[PDB]
Structure 1
Amino acid sequence: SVVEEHGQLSISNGELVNERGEQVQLKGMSSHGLQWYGQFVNYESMKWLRDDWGINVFRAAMYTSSGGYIDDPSVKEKVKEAVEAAIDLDIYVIIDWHILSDNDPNIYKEEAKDFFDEMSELYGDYPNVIYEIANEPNGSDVTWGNQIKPYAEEVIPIIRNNDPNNIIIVGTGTWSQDVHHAADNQLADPNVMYAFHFYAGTHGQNLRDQVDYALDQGAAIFVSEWGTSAATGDGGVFLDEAQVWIDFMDERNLSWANWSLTHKDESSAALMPGANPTGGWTEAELSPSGTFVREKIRES
């Protein structure tokens, strides 16, 4: 139903819109790393998230390093499974080239180009796909103008040769926080968005104002990862600040994916130790974070 109704997504005047030009807001879950917690990514669990939580997007977080794709490329087949499930479920799907410790996207750019060539050749004639080409650039020596923008200007052409206009999300500096610099030096492609990531354990008032600055430059922003925890993914759940961010995102029509769908013993994890990898979770099998995120998407 979602993808049949909204169909082809695009950017118009800095906003995500559907094929009839109406604003649309995606809300869903991210996997944790597919090399660690891939058992939670399958048609049945995605169907349960669609039907019980109300998700309309799912993000497949394919780490590159940390035992991910560069070390063992078999994880690309789990991305394919997730994309195919999203197609069958009629929801959107984010293919996330999940850089982190490999903090400059240029480190594995050759591999990225080949991966995105393959994915856009396979799936480029479906409207469900959203490409996220570099999760979280980070480090003082990785800047928008010097590293990230030129990386995007190598990878985007590869995708566009196969898929002329599905959305591409491009990471920003400082762990996808530095939307100000990206918004002042935007990419040419008209269906690009810039990633912004937050964690509710950080006091967020200036970060909200910086997102507003970026939006005021006509840049489109996708909150492709956020947590209810501290920036480590752990240390406590911060639902008051999370709610402030939820309301901000609704006011600004910002799409989002929450980190993350796993049973790992960390506060950002949505599931308890006993949660079935194929879905059907009871209240007791959701963590405090998961309970909150489910409520937010159901309310929407």
Structure 2
Amino acid sequence: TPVAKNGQLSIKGTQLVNRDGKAVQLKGISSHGLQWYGEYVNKDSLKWLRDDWGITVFRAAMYTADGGYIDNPSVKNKVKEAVEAAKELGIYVIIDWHILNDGNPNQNKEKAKEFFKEMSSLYGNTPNVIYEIANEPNGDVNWKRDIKPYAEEVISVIRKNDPDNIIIVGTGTWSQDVNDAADDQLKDANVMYALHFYAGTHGQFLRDKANYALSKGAPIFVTEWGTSDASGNGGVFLDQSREWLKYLDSKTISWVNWNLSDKQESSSALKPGASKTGGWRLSDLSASGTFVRENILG
């Protein structure tokens, strides 16, 4: 199992590497918002994904807004649950401070810093953990004015308890505007920038900004991508999805598919009715779910 095999991750240039300094490409899946679908996120289902799908990373998508942590912080217990499972299973785990309607990460910066102080404190001696501090900036929200200053403060409070675990920072326009990041990069040695795409929506233009970012030295991590369109629908777009994953392989970019749930949308891995604890029949999986599993089992 990884972490037992790769240990603690760091960044060599653009390439995510293991403790040996080997190139590593994590592949996995994200929960839906933990406030609605945390029932699917537990040591059993995570175990099933590890054992049946070969996932090497699980993302715990803790919405801040929309009935999430700001209004009900007890959801932090689901993050802690998933993390303990990940440590116990030898897989990596992303703690995703999942902004969306609160499109400016500054809106909730005080609560975000307090949240990350506790997590880095609890888990910062843990090689499993990756922090994702701001899922998707959007609106009149840009790198230089809004996202960078936030990242320095939040980063500064994480590094106190955890100096070396990977931190992934979202970018503008729903974690598309990596080029703006790529120009005015942070100094932290273990920071990556998030790139999100949907196969039914995003095409070559988004890949080019990504190419531009790498060429300027900014590492990229796909903390969220879907085989559906950006709404999370439109059916399951196999040509573009195949085309995207081909591109990501070519640069050894780690990725996390959206999403593990039985929600009634195209992006869901599961068909309605699917067990919360795994042990899923091949039929229980959606058209999306099947494709994603096939692309992790190599």
Paired residue type of 1:76: K
- 1:187-224 deviations in whole A, cap 9, x for unaligned? 11010000000000024112112111101011000000
**CA distance, structure 1, for counterparts of residue 110 and residue 206 of structure 2:** 33
The secondary structure found in structure 2 opposite 1:102 is coil
Partner in structure 1 of residue 164 of structure 2: 165
Which residue is 1:51 aligned to?
51
1-side partners of 2:83 and 2:192: how far apart?
20
User: Residues 156-207 of structure 1: CA distance to partner in whole angstroms, max 9, x if unpaired?
Assistant: 0100000001000000000000011000110110100000000000241121
Matches within 5 A, 1:276-287: 276-287=275-286
1:63 corresponds in structure 2 to 63
Seq. identity, %: 69
Moved over 3 A (4+): none
Look up the match of 1:76. 76
Deviation digits for residues 45-81 of structure 1 (CA, Å, limit 9, x no counterpart):
0000000000000000000000000010000000000
Q: Quick one: distance in 1 between partners of 2:192 and 2:43?
A: 27
**Distance in 1 separating the partners of 2:273 and 2:73:** 29
Structure 1 residue 143 corresponds to structure 2 residue 142: yes
Counterpart amino acid of residue 267 in structure 2: S
Partner Cα distance (1:269, 1:287) in 2: 7
Q: Deviations over 1:2-44 (max 9, x none)?
A: 1111001000111100001110000000000000001100000
What is the CA distance between 1:235 and its match in structure 2? 2.0
> Secondary structure at 2:257's aligned position in 1?
strand
Paired AA for residue 191 in structure 1 = N
1:253 counterpart = 2:252: yes
Q: Which residue of 1 aligns with 2:221?
A: 222
Quick check: which one's helix share is greater?
Answer: 1
Corresponding residue of 1:264: 263
1:116 is matched with 116
User: Could you tell me how far apart the structure 2 residues matched to 1:55 and 1:127 are?
Assistant: 16
Unaligned runs of 5+ in 2: none
Distance 1:61-1:203 versus aligned 2 partners, 3 A rule: closer
Residue aligning to 1:290: 289
Residue 19 of structure 1: aligned partner = 19
Alignment RMSD: 0.6
Provide structure 1 residue ranges, at least 5 long, that are not aligned to the other structure. Answer: none
1:137 partner amino acid: P
Shift of residue 256 of structure 1? 0.6
2:21, 2:283 → 1: CA distance?
Answer: 41
Number of equivalenced pairs: 298
Which residue identity does 1:240 align to in structure 2?
Answer: D
Shift of 1:283: 1.2
